Ligand binder design. Structure first.
Ligand code: KIV
Ligand code: KIV
Ligand code: ZN
Ligand code: ZN
Lengths: 379, 379
């Protein structure tokens, strides 16, 4: 039986990509939505960025429920690591999260340093972090641009093993920019797991540039990833982080056990939509207005039975697909109702009652016609 | 080198799920957008549905460019097949598309017939189709609900081999409802390819209920699928069909050769958006308003270089990320401009010029401040 932790990064990766970043009270509202959704951990921010974010991280750390991992992000240097720890140490379960780049391009063309120097930086930063937080505290290390570490993939194994030996309990593998295809990333995850084994938790953090973040994250589980970093409503850099709802529902549909309160999905998404001013597209998976419609029939319980993965109510929505007597499906519905009661009426009579249904609907507006009165109208 | 055909089903699967189905002139406009996008084939409709759709299919068949496959969908019965052929026979390259269910549930609980009877129906319908279209004409067979053919997967191999032997040139594998995970579907595709080999083209047709249609379609290519059925703007049943743009761009980024005019992507999507009244979400991959923004820096060419898959212009968009002197990034931009010219100004002076930039922008509205005048303002 697989353990899969859903790690939310909305307050960090999501907030920082926002056209209109959140105030402290909005961040607190979002934090509370995350707690009620029962995610397995929450990254509250990047406290080194500025004094406001520092304050927010501290407030959220103290608000955090007991036993709920509270993470904050730091770059790989002693002073910033110390500041980060100061931000979160008051949380019941603080988690230190350190990032450093590991891709060939980053090392050769951005950092312009050797691989040996990279390993030294990784080891020194994680070791230092462990020196200030003590033994009981989870440390996560992210290899930035891991998804692009193609030419230096072997190095990447060394980097993560180094991080673990220095004290990292979680190795986070980001697909910082989505460039290829899920199984390219997933094969890399598999090879990392092959050398990490039980020495650390493998986490993944995928972005959605080619519309394949959910798939990449989901398939990573089946090669050994036990944590997925996600965001509400697919917020985050560019096209966004891995969508929390799609990932949670997909894993559930595949038989996995998650702590997520699935029925909080829709009320959460609606509120996040309001807080960001980003409407929920009507065809958006899980939460889209129109995704439970089965309309194709109009052109010619069975639809609900053979063509639905999960019910509206499962994600906290009301089922709005109610048989009506006032539309393109209106006419045939009256036929079926009359059939049920054993009332025989000609095709012209049905066409008649059809018009009466749309009539007494406009009067006392709109469209709320009962079977009982429709039976009374015919006979 | 892989051959991958992009087969558009917007005028069929897309149109029939539409809240407001298209008129003949709108269908013609959509058809023309598809031709200009240079998709490899177009399914024009379901001509058996009604006389209007029949007429539309005939009009589009005659409008179709030479050498462009024009498909229309039919259920697996002689009279409907004959009607369908009548609808499309005038196209330069007509393609007959027949569907019949193949999943355990469909056969046992919906059709309530034996597997032997299913094979007979498949063979008879394809053989009949071949009898009326002649040898030169492509026949596609779809096994409806293939993605759910888990308990009877072995049967599914028999069904497709039967279809091929009867005359099917293309075997289409739909993930009618997205229920699991890409690699479950993809493994099934692989096993079908293992027995079909070079006897027919494998096509896939995935839906997007769990947000993983693009991935499922893309990964299917790497186990032998040579045709992908897609729709503009992810139109189609429920959450929609596989999104054309994401699929085309992903395959291109993975080094594949497609005929798609990539630079038609954005103008097409914008027009389809208008025709359906479904806005393009600002975080939608490829075409979303906000997906080329790199904003996270504000919180503390490189961003464009290390964090972009493809350029805005590649998909027919204008790059709107222009360095401005009027915002939260405004102040530092003036610093850098003054640095370039070797003009030294105090931190208070920069703060001053910052205010002058926002001032002469409101006057003669709005926000269009040149470097040249900003240099003239400082010195
Ligand atoms: C800090 C890391 C995980 C990051 O956000 C990226 O690589 O996408
Ligand atoms: C006709 C077939 C391909 C169909 O639309 C479905 O199975 O999704
Ligand atoms: Zn990220
Ligand atoms: Zn379909």
């Amino acid at each position: 039986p697989k353990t899969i932790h859903i790690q939310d990064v909305t307050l960090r990766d999501g907030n920082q990509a926002l056209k209109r970043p959140w105030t402290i009270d909005e961040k607190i509202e979002v934090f509370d939505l995350l707690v009620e959704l029962n995610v397995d951990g929450i990254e509250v921010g990047f406290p080194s960025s500025n004094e406001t974010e520092f304050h927010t991280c501290q407030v959220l750390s103290k608000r955090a429920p007991k036993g709920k991992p509270i993470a904050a992000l730091s770059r790989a240097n002693q002073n910033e690591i110390a500041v980060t720890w100061e931000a979160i140490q008051k949380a019941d379960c603080p988690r230190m999260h350190i990032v450093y780049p590991v891709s060939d391009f980053s090392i050769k063309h951005v950092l312009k340093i050797s691989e040996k120097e990279v390993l030294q930086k990784i080891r020194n930063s994680i070791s230092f972090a462990r020196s200030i937080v003590g033994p009981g505290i989870e440390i996560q290390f992210s290899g930035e641009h891991f998804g692009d570490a193609i030419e230096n993939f072997a190095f990447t194994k060394e980097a993560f093993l180094t991080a673990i030996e220095a004290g990292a309990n979680i190795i986070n593998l980001p697909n910082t920019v989505e460039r290829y295809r899920p199984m390219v990333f997933v094969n890399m995850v598999k090879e990392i797991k092959d050398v990490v084994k039980d020495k650390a938790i493998i986490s993944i953090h995928t972005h959605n540039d080619l519309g394949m973040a959910t798939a990449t994250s989901v398939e990573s589980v089946y090669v050994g990833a036990e944590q997925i970093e996600v965001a509400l409503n697919g917020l985050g850099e560019r096209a966004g982080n891995t969508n929390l709802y799609e990932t949670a529902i997909a894993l559930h549909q595949n038989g996995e056990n998650l702590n997520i309160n699935f029925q909080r999905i829709y009320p959460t998404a609606k509120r996040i939509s309001e807080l960001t001013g980003i409407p929920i597209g009507e065809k958006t998976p899980i939460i889209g207005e129109d995704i439970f419609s089965h309309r194709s029939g109009i052109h010619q319980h069975q639809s609900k039975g053979a063509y639905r993965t999960f019910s509206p109510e499962f994600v906290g929505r009301m089922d709005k697909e109610t048989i009506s007597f006032t539309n393109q499906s209106g006419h045939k519905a009256i036929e079926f109702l009359l059939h049920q009661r054993g009332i025989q009426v000609s095709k012209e009579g049905i066409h008649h009652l059809f018009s009466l249904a749309k009539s007494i609907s406009s009067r006392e507006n709109n469209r709320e016609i009962t079977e009982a009165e429709l039976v009374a109208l015919s006979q």
